[PDB]
A paper describes a structure:
Our previous analyses demonstrated that NO66176–C exists as a tetramer in solution. We further compared the tetrameric structure of the NO66176–C–Ni2+ and NO66176–C–Rpl8204–224 complexes. In contrast to the similarity of the monomeric structure, the relative positions of the active sites of each subunit change in the two structures. The distance between the active sites in the dimer linked by interface II is 1.8 Å closer in the complex structure than in NO66176–C–Ni2+. When binding to substrate, the relative positions of each subunit in the [name] tetramer shift. Oligomerization may facilitate the motion of each subunit in the [name] tetramer and affect the catalytic activity.
[name] ([name]) is a [name] domain-containing protein which has been reported to be a histone demethylase and a ribosome protein 8 ([name]) hydroxylase. [name] ([name]) is a metazoan [name] domain-containing protein that is highly conserved throughout evolution and was initially identified as a dual-location intranuclear protein. Evidence from a recent study indicated that [name] hydroxylates ribosome protein 8 ([name]) and controls the biogenesis of the ribosome, which is consistent with the observation that [name] is a constitutive nucleolar component. Moreover, previous work demonstrated that [name] assembles as a tetramer and that the binding site of [name] to osterix is located on the surface formed by a hinge region (interface I) from neighbouring subunits in the tetramer.
Residue numbers in the entry:
A (entry chain D), B (entry chain B), C (entry chain A), D (entry chain C): 181 to 639
Amino acid sequence: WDSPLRRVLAELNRIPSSRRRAARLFEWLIAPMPPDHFYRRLWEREAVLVRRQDHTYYQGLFSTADLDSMLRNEEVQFGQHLDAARYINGRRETLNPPGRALPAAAWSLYQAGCSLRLLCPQAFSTTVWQFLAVLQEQFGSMAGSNVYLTPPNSQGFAPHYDDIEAFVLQLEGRKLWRVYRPRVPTEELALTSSPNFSQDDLGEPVLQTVLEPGDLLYFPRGFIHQAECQDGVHSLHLTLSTYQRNTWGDFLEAILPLAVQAAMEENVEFRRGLPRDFMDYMGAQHSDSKDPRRTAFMEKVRVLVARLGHFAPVDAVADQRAKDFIHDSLPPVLTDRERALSVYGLPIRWEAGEPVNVGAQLTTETEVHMLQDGIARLVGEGGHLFLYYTVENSRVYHLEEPKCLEIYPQQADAMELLLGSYPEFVRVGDLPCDSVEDQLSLATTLYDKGLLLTKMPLA
Amino acid sequence: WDSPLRRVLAELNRIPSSRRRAARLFEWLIAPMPPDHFYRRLWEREAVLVRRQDHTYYQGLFSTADLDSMLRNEEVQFGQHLDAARYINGRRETLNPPGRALPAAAWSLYQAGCSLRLLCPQAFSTTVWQFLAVLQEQFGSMAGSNVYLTPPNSQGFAPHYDDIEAFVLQLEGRKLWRVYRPRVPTEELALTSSPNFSQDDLGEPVLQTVLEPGDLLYFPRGFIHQAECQDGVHSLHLTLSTYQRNTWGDFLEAILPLAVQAAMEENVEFRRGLPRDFMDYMGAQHSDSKDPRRTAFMEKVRVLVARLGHFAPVDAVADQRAKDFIHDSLPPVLTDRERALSVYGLPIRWEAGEPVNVGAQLTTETEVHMLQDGIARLVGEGGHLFLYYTVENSRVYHLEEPKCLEIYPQQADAMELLLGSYPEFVRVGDLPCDSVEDQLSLATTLYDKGLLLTKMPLA
Amino acid sequence: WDSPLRRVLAELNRIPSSRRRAARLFEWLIAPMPPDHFYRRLWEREAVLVRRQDHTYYQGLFSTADLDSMLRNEEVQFGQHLDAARYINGRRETLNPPGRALPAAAWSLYQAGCSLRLLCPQAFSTTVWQFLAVLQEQFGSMAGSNVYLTPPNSQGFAPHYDDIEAFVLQLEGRKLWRVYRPRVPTEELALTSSPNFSQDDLGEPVLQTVLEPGDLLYFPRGFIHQAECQDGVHSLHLTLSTYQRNTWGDFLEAILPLAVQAAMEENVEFRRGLPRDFMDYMGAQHSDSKDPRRTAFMEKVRVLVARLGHFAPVDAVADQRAKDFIHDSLPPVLTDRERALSVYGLPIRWEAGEPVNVGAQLTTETEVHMLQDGIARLVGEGGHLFLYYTVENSRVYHLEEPKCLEIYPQQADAMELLLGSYPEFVRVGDLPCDSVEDQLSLATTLYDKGLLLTKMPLA
Amino acid sequence: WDSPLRRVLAELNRIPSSRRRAARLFEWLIAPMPPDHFYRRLWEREAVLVRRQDHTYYQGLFSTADLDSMLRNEEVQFGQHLDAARYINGRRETLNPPGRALPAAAWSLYQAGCSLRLLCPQAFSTTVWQFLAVLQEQFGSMAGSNVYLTPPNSQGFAPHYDDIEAFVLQLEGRKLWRVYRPRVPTEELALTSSPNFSQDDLGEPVLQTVLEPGDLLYFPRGFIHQAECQDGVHSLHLTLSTYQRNTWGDFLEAILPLAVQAAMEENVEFRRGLPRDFMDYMGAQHSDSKDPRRTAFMEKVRVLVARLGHFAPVDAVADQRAKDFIHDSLPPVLTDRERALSVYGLPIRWEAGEPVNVGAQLTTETEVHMLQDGIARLVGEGGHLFLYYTVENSRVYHLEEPKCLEIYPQQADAMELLLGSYPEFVRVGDLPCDSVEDQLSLATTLYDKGLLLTKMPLA
Ligand SMILES: O=C(O)CNC(=O)C(=O)O
Ligand SMILES: O=C(O)CNC(=O)C(=O)O
Ligand SMILES: O=C(O)CNC(=O)C(=O)O
Ligand code: NI
Ligand code: NI
Ligand code: NI
Ligand code: NI
């Protein structure tokens, strides 16, 4: 009734800092490999196998039993929540009947040699939720997961790459995995998922191995992979994915239109007229021209492009990606102390015909900090100040719109101070505001919204 | 019956190249100032006044009498075609009753002190159309016009700047003009039109002068200007306009997103993942962060942006701007020769119950060149090659959608040759083509659309 | 140079009432057959042939020569303006090259046996305009036209029926026409155009005849018809069309949803709750049920539909249809008298630097009547009162948007009087308004818009 | 652990027929008054107070304790889920802070003086879900409910009337209600919710009582009502609501456009052209006319409308409303026996390592019937046969699309049979199909979708 995993979880509960929690969990996830080694040399470059030598490593995360109660007690739909898949004679085809996915239907598909894939494990299981909710804080990119249940003597899926950084957690059974290097430069760190491939289309595997429970297998986006079950045992695995559209390229995409517009507003060379007659030497039809105006034009394009770095709003865009990450974020999993010290742990309830324990209000004396570290971001838009937060997000991606509350200019400095000083308590009375009304109102607002905690329970 | 203008038109009819006709008329427009001096020093830099000392210079172009017949014989509409406005006691009013602009309404508005503005003189005047259609060819930019009639002792419009390069042709009467240099760096070569300014907002004119018929005033976008009729005499002028959104910045706007897209598809530095914690040091909150990872991130942006220049498809963007110019352009004005030697000049008509003078096909002995030099442009899009042309455009702006015909790859070299050797004749049989048929095919196709003239009439 | 057509138009210009003009021209159009006989017994009932015995009857209306000038001097396009079609071996081919329809393209198509179909003759021909604009006034419905030119020894089009009442006016040459009664009850007075039919689909013609210039052929919507040119001569005809979607059913479609909505607002029977269990006895599955609640339900539906007649806003729907007709209508063709006595005839012009002949205002002594009888209609919408008018419409269908001016409540009676008493003159001072100022101002507005004429010119 | 409510549910769980269950529960709901009396003279006419003399009638349904838990354990939002309302000094006020509804916020709004309205108790409560699911089966119309919780000495909501038939169940505390007869003819059986009224707009009540636990207070749409908590005690009630837009009027709205369309296709008088001159005597300007042609037009509009009943597709519209109802319907509550005899009862599951308890397929000897009576409906669209069902609906209104499966016509008569013949069993081998493959495939299909039960479990 215990695993390394239930222990690491019990551990996370005791570490006060969300930042520290995430770092710790990631260490665990890849142990004995050190994070720092992994991130500096292996991540995005190398396929990685961690032979755990433990069969009980991930016990308490997720299991086929979990799925079977899920099909029975939760409204799981084919195509929305669960897939049914078969690769045979170099040909894959989905077999989801439309509508609800009942055990009866599901298990019949298993018995016919269809794998089952559950698209949002974190919606229906609180242990996957917590796992992902913690790890996303150290990835600075949303982490989602798919759970893959493959029957004996069969392959579910075709060889292919994905558009995310993959962590395969083997959960039950065994599977033969083949992983390859990218076939060409343009497939390295591929931007979008590949078509399903055929076996002719592949080279040699860089890594071929039989995974077993507790084992972990990681490979960057672009690394083609397949996986089969061999001798009368099955596979269960959870693959954890992150880093979707989180490239330098995606950063520039957002920076550029702004930079050109800043440059055109602020500097008259970007507002000058094109030549009257550039059409006489620019264009496909003239790509071979030896007119020297051609090479002047090119050279001016190149410097003007270069000169836009100076006008790029790197900070504003970082904030905008921060805002999208908040929106993308799973809502936080509280420690017991965190809940107990917050609005969620106030003991006010309904007891025999009335509400009992109206709590204390917060005073200048109350000491406070941000509930956690990875749940809020302050962002300027149109000369206004908004705090976006994760605490009301659903455990389905984007099920809620992005949530935020205004921060008035007078309260700005205090908010920045709060965000920047987690996890160090601070007197409400000591927040850098003009009045005492402002100090209270800020903290009250933040406390009521489930963003703040007090050193000692209000009641 | 004769004027400097009617002589220069007659002269244009005898100059065989449309390139040369355009150069000549601009030379005429600014005479005696040299075009190369003007474009090298004054264009985009400085207001310019040309005291013609010839009050007949522009006769035949446009007169108030034309305006009057126009109101009576065409469907001229307030708002769409004609504004009537009054500047008094520092306010700008607009008095456009809705609907038709009859002579009776228009002339009473004028009698109450209203200035009348014709928005598209070139829709109702063949002499204005021809003027602009020739000039657009040596501007590389659409040339617009507006005609302004002001009654004695009034100002129609409040001071402002325009977003276009303006040439003011004083046609009747006299007007006192004031033109000011740009007030501040950001209004030099301004991007968009000004609001109505008050006289408290102005500095000192750089030029204040009373224009008389025949004179010319030019001032760049961003130069504020205002005008009034002074004692006992009205004014008519035509302002010729061009260079709307035709700047280096506009070219960059289109280039950038293509460039970033090509860099991501072609180079993995762009495909690399952002740091997992850039949010810790980047954002409005960290403007003044000493952290060594901010300056290293900023530095990388500046170098990646610089590297986009190597990826910029400059030629394809030039073709896209050329295609928009073809779409923006007035349909061409043919010389007597160009008409006679083209499809428009074919003698074929209906005569006494049937068609007669049914003409000869072209042969491989037929000698050809493009009908004019500013009527067509070859553009590549999505693997295919298209010839966009102006000969079916309307004298109303964008009343027609962009027009083209497909050029197959076999025919591309011949097409490129024809565009590039205007106005030298080429035997159809001497065209780069893989077959005689291919030779005939392209020539026939271009002749029928009115894109081609033969050395001798087909009939 | 004189023809029965040119005489009847010269006659129309001397008939002071537009109502009378419209009735006169229809009498002419079907002479010697009396209109009252035609509309009582033949209209919507029978195909009618009128052998004119006068090849000159229509001379002046439209000729193939007019088509030729129109291809050359107007921007006539294929598709938009002009179809080129061929019917052979039982198959309708359209051969419209895209773009301009120059004479050379069009006549070669005609020489390859294509007929040409001009879609909006009234846009390019003032005499067809006049013809249609006059006739619409006695149809109560838009009068459209197409011109069909067919070469010798060919058929342009497959047999078919159209959705309009058709009048075929043979202009040149000869054509062998066949017209068929409705093949079936459901095709009598058909609602929409037919597909192209083969000859296997056709019964026996009710009329088969060779038309010669001056003849007329009429047949109702749903009568199939086809036509070929036979021994070495061409044909040119003009088909006049009208009564598109102008039925009692069309009137009902609009009446019903207003009637139901008023019944529900004004009477509680319509508001009561359906029977809690009607689904047990009503539905396809209970077609042949015997439950006596099914037949009680059916009888309640029959009585409630019946009762909706009492709530039908018949007059309002009449006005909406009239407003649609105002929008649909061609702009009016003024007699010389009407032009002289209106705002269009006003002699104010620009002359040598100045307007001249500034004419008097209306006074309460001016006598006035509406410019014509079918240029305006007063329509109540949403508590306000609007006068919709046709004088600013274009000769292209719906090229302008419906046009009205607000008629304030105080002016209603005067407006109604004017509309209802054309063509009797009324002194402005005799109009039913509350003030003299109100009398002058209604009249001035109408006059200025071109809706009114004065017994004597204002100048 | 017992109440009249749990007994009637326990009673309900032994009644084999869903129809009978629904009838039974409604009887219990208004006990001791007979349904047959209520529906025949009370429903839609009268206010109705059922004094229960039994404070424990509804115990088990919903309590303020259930609310508290829900705030605490479910993601309940202000606006979407909960409302916080205060009626004071004659003004309604909404006091919802954006976002989540936590006990803290909720109970302080309670103690400030706000009522708390829960807009979808059936989403969070299984008992209320069962209640309504059962009742809707005997309303033929969606049953939905709101729970209102008002603190002592306040009023939450101003006087108003509603667009539904209301059943107020008093659950806790006591409220003094006032109900009113409709104020005027047009308010009787009102179509849309009234505005908030003042105590001026009101009349003198028709009913005025202090409600008490176990009581019920019914009244029809249009009936005004307000309700306060006087000295010393709170209120908790659940109002059940139905008959939103289920009127004769609404039936006719859907019937008519199709009636006219059918009439125009099937009968030529509905397709005959309007008079050419109706505009001369029809329209608001002629509402006074004495033209006898007008009275003929009116009389003709009237008969044509009355004639539309013959063409009304009454059955098709019944089926469409039936389809809308299946879409609006709560998913069913199975009995223990229904569960056991269906696909949901199958004992199939994931034992330690494998699936086990694979049920038997069905055979021609299996005895089948519809899972319940109010869960499916056969509808014809475009000669296609679709069986719309409710078994996958959510407990949130229209959260899902209308769900269905296609009945092929070989199965048609068999499907019809089952629907018509519940709750009595039928051999699969006796179903009216051509072949045995059809017999089986229909029953299988219906079984796996949760639509069909077997006499004995398949395992
Ligand atoms: O005519 C005036 O008073 C103002 N005219 C213009 O602004 C112009 O020609 O561009
Ligand atoms: O002229 C033809 O061959 C066909 N004519 C028509 O279809 C017509 O006038 O309605
Ligand atoms: O509970 C209240 O105060 C008011 N309730 C209602 O208006 C209702 O049930 O319809
Ligand atoms: Ni994968
Ligand atoms: Ni200007
Ligand atoms: Ni026809
Ligand atoms: Ni209510």
